[PDB]
Amino acid sequence: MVKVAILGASGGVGQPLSLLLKLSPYVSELALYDIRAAEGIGKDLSHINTNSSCVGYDKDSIENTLSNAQVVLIPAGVPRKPGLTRDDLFKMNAGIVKSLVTAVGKFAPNARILVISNPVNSLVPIAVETLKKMGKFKPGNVMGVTNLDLVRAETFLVDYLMLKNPKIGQEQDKTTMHRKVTVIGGHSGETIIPIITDKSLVFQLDKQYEHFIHRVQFGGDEIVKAKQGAGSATLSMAFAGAKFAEEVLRSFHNEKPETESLSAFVYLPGLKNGKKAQQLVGDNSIEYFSLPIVLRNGSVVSIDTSVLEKLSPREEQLVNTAVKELRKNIEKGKSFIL
């Protein structure tokens, strides 16, 4: 059935991501690539008694890694650290994503590409425009992994209900809260739009609602601070990213997604209902948004816009703020490569 490659497998995200993917029953080969250390990490994980073969490859061996792959996860990139501006991160990461995605376009042009590298809002456009340049772009096959934002929302909605109201918070199970909240937009504090779909819950949060919003939005900053400068979220990204990959993998075996309204940052003009999404977010030419997606054989075949149809006034304002930032993020991406 399905070969997964992981480009950037040896990093803080990449190792535990590789570990979690070795545990997936949907994977048949697992290939790990990095500029260093991947062969040892693959060997390490090949001892695990799950059915997948796991090989890591050296820095000169991206082709062996990619050849025949159906899904390509990209945790490669440079993470936030104290000596580094957003613009530093943007340019270094843009080079990485370009080379790795050019490698995909040459060695496995049909694979579903799941981009973890940050800034997702501008690097996804880099991915797409690189593939378009190559004549290799399939819009269903390029996904910005924004699912860590959904993981946080689920977690924080329970943690904020516990605080306000130990009554209601008892009955909440963090593992199933995706029934009650959906995250859309982009992946930065200006662009993350948490949409509580259970309107009762919005009211029960009361004055903790605005804190909840802010917490989901700035979760990235929170871990950077916790890790005392040197480090960003790694382990929980690995988790979120493997969860998303597992939905993409499910969809090769004709199975229902476990997350209701699973979102990824996708190219609206190439996907069904993208034009309706554009209108619904108030901007007729915006090219990318993180929105709930429908998967078949690991490709996005439609966008489900339901969550855009019942926005509160407050949420409309979050959308508006997101759109204006996103337009700039996208343009910075496209123009770095055009």
Ligand X SMILES: NC(=O)c1ccc[n+]([C@@H]2O[C@H](COP(=O)([O-])OP(=O)(O)OC[C@H]3O[C@@H](n4cnc5c(N)ncnc54)[C@H](O)[C@@H]3O)[C@@H](O)[C@H]2O)c1
Ligand Y SMILES: O=C([O-])CC(=O)C(=O)O
**Residues assigned a catalytic role:** 187
Angle, in degrees to the nearest 10, between helices 120-133 and 86-107: 30
Q: What does 40 interact with, of a second copy, ligand X, ligand Y, none (CB < 5 to 8 A by kind)?
A: a second copy
- Please tell me whether residue 39 binds a second copy under the rule CB under 8 A: yes
Encode burial over 158-193: b for 16+ CB neighbours within 10 A, e otherwise. bbbbeebeeeebeebeeeebbebbbbbbbbbebbbb
H-only helix segments in 227-291: 235-250, 274-280
Nearer to ligand Y, 16 or 79 (CB): 79
Q: How far apart are CA 54 and CA 45, in angstroms?
A: 7
Q: Which does 75 bind (CB under 5 to 8 A by kind): ligand X, ligand Y, a second copy, none?
A: ligand X
Task: Please work out the total of residues on this chain that contact ligand Y, with binding judged by CB under 6 A.
Answer: 10
Contacts of 34 (CB under 8 A, 6+ apart): 7, 8, 9, 10, 11, 14, 41, 56, 59, 76
3-class SS at 67?
Answer: coil
Smallest distance from the beta carbon of 269 to ligand X, in angstroms?
A: 23
Task: List residues bridging with 264 in a β-sheet.
Answer: 291
Q: Which of 233, 245, 281, 323 binds ligand Y (CB under 6 A)?
A: 233
Report if residue 121 touches a second copy, rule: CB under 8 A.
no
What is the closest distance, in whole angstroms, from the C-beta atom of residue 163 to a second copy in the complex?
13
Name which position in 2, 233, 248, 303 contacts a second copy (CB under 8 A).
233
Interface residues with ligand X (CB under 6 A) are 7-8, 10-14, 33-36, 75-79, 93, 96, 99-100, 116-118, 120, 145, 148, 187, 232-234, 237
- Chain residues binding ligand Y by CB under 6 A are 79-80, 118, 148, 219-220, 223-224, 232-233
